Write an enzyme that holds these catalytic residues in place. Structure first.
Site, PDB file in Angstrom:
ATOM      1  N   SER A   1       0.801  -1.213   0.000  1.00  0.00           N
ATOM      2  CA  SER A   1       0.000   0.000   0.000  1.00  0.00           C
ATOM      3  C   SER A   1       0.838   1.268   0.000  1.00  0.00           C
ATOM      4  O   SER A   1       0.273   2.351  -0.178  1.00  0.00           O
ATOM      5  CB  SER A   1      -0.943  -0.004   1.203  1.00  0.00           C
ATOM      6  OG  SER A   1      -2.136  -0.708   0.912  1.00  0.00           O
TER       7      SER A   1
ATOM      8  N   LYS B   1       0.444   3.818  -2.789  1.00  0.00           N
ATOM      9  CA  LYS B   1      -0.548   4.885  -2.777  1.00  0.00           C
ATOM     10  C   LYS B   1       0.068   6.270  -2.599  1.00  0.00           C
ATOM     11  O   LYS B   1      -0.590   7.266  -2.916  1.00  0.00           O
ATOM     12  CB  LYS B   1      -1.576   4.625  -1.672  1.00  0.00           C
ATOM     13  CG  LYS B   1      -2.378   3.348  -1.856  1.00  0.00           C
ATOM     14  CD  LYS B   1      -3.519   3.277  -0.855  1.00  0.00           C
ATOM     15  CE  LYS B   1      -4.461   2.118  -1.135  1.00  0.00           C
ATOM     16  NZ  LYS B   1      -4.209   0.996  -0.225  1.00  0.00           N
TER      17      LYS B   1
ATOM     18  N   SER C   1      -6.408   3.557   3.742  1.00  0.00           N
ATOM     19  CA  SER C   1      -5.793   2.781   2.651  1.00  0.00           C
ATOM     20  C   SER C   1      -6.829   1.993   1.841  1.00  0.00           C
ATOM     21  O   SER C   1      -6.610   0.842   1.457  1.00  0.00           O
ATOM     22  CB  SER C   1      -4.686   1.866   3.171  1.00  0.00           C
ATOM     23  OG  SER C   1      -3.678   1.693   2.187  1.00  0.00           O
TER      24      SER C   1
ATOM     25  N   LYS D   1       2.470   6.832   5.709  1.00  0.00           N
ATOM     26  CA  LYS D   1       1.688   5.779   5.060  1.00  0.00           C
ATOM     27  C   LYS D   1       2.033   4.396   5.617  1.00  0.00           C
ATOM     28  O   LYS D   1       3.205   4.068   5.760  1.00  0.00           O
ATOM     29  CB  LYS D   1       1.931   5.789   3.543  1.00  0.00           C
ATOM     30  CG  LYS D   1       0.969   4.949   2.732  1.00  0.00           C
ATOM     31  CD  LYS D   1      -0.453   5.450   2.883  1.00  0.00           C
ATOM     32  CE  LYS D   1      -1.459   4.454   2.341  1.00  0.00           C
ATOM     33  NZ  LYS D   1      -1.588   3.235   3.222  1.00  0.00           N
TER      34      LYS D   1
HETATM   35  C1  CES Z   1      -1.864  -1.860   1.605  1.00  0.00           C
HETATM   36  O1  CES Z   1      -0.857  -2.444   1.845  1.00  0.00           O
HETATM   37  C2  CES Z   1      -3.202  -2.470   1.976  1.00  0.00           C
HETATM   38  N1  CES Z   1      -3.016  -3.899   2.057  1.00  0.00           N
HETATM   39  C3  CES Z   1      -3.993  -4.833   1.525  1.00  0.00           C
HETATM   40  O2  CES Z   1      -4.986  -4.424   1.021  1.00  0.00           O
HETATM   41  C4  CES Z   1      -3.729  -6.336   1.647  1.00  0.00           C
HETATM   42  N2  CES Z   1      -3.303  -7.012   0.679  1.00  0.00           N
HETATM   43  O3  CES Z   1      -3.059  -8.397   0.825  1.00  0.00           O
HETATM   44  C5  CES Z   1      -2.775  -9.014  -0.399  1.00  0.00           C
HETATM   45  C6  CES Z   1      -3.982  -7.000   2.988  1.00  0.00           C
HETATM   46  C7  CES Z   1      -4.030  -8.316   3.393  1.00  0.00           C
HETATM   47  C8  CES Z   1      -4.303  -8.321   4.721  1.00  0.00           C
HETATM   48  C9  CES Z   1      -4.433  -7.015   5.143  1.00  0.00           C
HETATM   49  O4  CES Z   1      -4.235  -6.208   4.062  1.00  0.00           O
HETATM   50  C10 CES Z   1      -3.688  -1.858   3.319  1.00  0.00           C
HETATM   51  N3  CES Z   1      -2.564  -2.415   4.446  1.00  0.00           N
HETATM   52  C11 CES Z   1      -3.007  -2.226   5.899  1.00  0.00           C
HETATM   53  C12 CES Z   1      -1.889  -2.069   6.918  1.00  0.00           C
HETATM   54  O5  CES Z   1      -0.978  -1.257   6.660  1.00  0.00           O
HETATM   55  O6  CES Z   1      -1.844  -2.742   7.977  1.00  0.00           O
HETATM   56  C13 CES Z   1      -4.662  -1.797   6.272  1.00  0.00           C
HETATM   57  C14 CES Z   1      -5.053  -1.455   7.709  1.00  0.00           C
HETATM   58  C15 CES Z   1      -5.571  -1.514   5.200  1.00  0.00           C
HETATM   59  S1  CES Z   1      -5.106  -2.295   3.700  1.00  0.00           S
END
Ligand code: CES
Length: 247
Positions: free
Chosen positions: A35, A38, A95, A199
């Protein structure tokens, strides 16, 4: 440099003034960033507003994600139409991946990853950086990767080009005009004095990641943590890096 015992596999803290490292661990190693992608999307949204190419009050329909399970503004609200302003806030606070993809698609449609990588080159990032999507979600099995050194270059360039970005990332909660509450994933806001960004990120491959930034008395630092073990530990790592940064 001090002997830190961090959870992160790769980490560093840099002074913005001279771009010089105060601590580096594996700072050249290519890492998944998730993420953290972003932040490039935010940069290009802010550029487009300045270029008279995008309106904060434009109403857009959230794009649907191939996996309805991913973190998404639509799942939390059941609301599809949102202003560019609120999509931008959602991308930076909670996010929301569909917010990020909706913004990237509006800007450049299918060609938006090319624009992210074009802009990565213009910002001095090395050829080890590869963006694949506006949200940092994998595309065709391909993942976004970078280094803590390239992530520093992106972060400091974002902050010096669009300082107003910190007006959004410094807020534990963002309330939109119509009253929607968007909770930040940055749990250090209000715990380290001067911290105002930047971020979070997480995937199984990337671990728990965080880019932080703080300013005290004209001195700004930017810390980068990649592949920490838990959601709490990337913040404990940041606390140690900020302490080195303001030594
Ligand atoms: C950005 O990294 C985003 N991550 C995900 O959407 C994601 N992708 O897995 C393939 C995932 C899996 C489990 C949790 O997210 C955002 N990352 C986070 C964080 O930084 O902890 C949150 C709270 C929202 S999604």
């Amino acid at each position: 440099q001090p002997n830190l015992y961090l959870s992160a596999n790769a980490a560093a803290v840099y002074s913005v003034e001279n771009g010089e490292a105060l601590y580096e661990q594996n700072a050249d190693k290519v890492m998944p960033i998730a993420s953290l992608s972003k932040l490039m999307t935010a940069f290009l949204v802010l550029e487009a507003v300045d270029n008279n190419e995008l309106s904060w009050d434009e109403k857009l329909d959230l794009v649907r994600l191939d996996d309805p399970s991913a973190v998404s503004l639509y799942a939390i609200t059941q609301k599809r139409t949102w202003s560019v302003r609120d999509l931008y806030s959602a991308m930076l606070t909670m996010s929301a991946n569909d917010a990020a993809e909706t913004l990237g698609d509006r800007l450049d449609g299918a060609d938006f990853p090319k624009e992210m990588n074009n802009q990565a080159k213009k910002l001095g990032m090395s050829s080890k950086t590869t963006f694949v999507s506006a949200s940092g979600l994998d595309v065709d099995g391909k993942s976004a990767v970078s280094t803590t050194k390239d992530l520093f270059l992106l972060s400091s360039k974002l902050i010096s080009t669009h300082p107003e970005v910190l007006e959004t990332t410094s807020k534990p909660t963002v309330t939109t005009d119509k009253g929607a509450k968007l909770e930040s994933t940055n749990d250090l806001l209000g715990s380290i004095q001067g911290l105002d960004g930047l971020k979070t990120g997480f995937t199984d491959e990337a671990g728990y990641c965080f880019i932080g930034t703080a300013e005290r008395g004209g001195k700004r630092v930017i810390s980068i943590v990649l592949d920490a073990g838990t959601a709490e530990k990337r913040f404990k790592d940041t606390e140690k890096l900020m302490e080195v940064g303001f030594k």
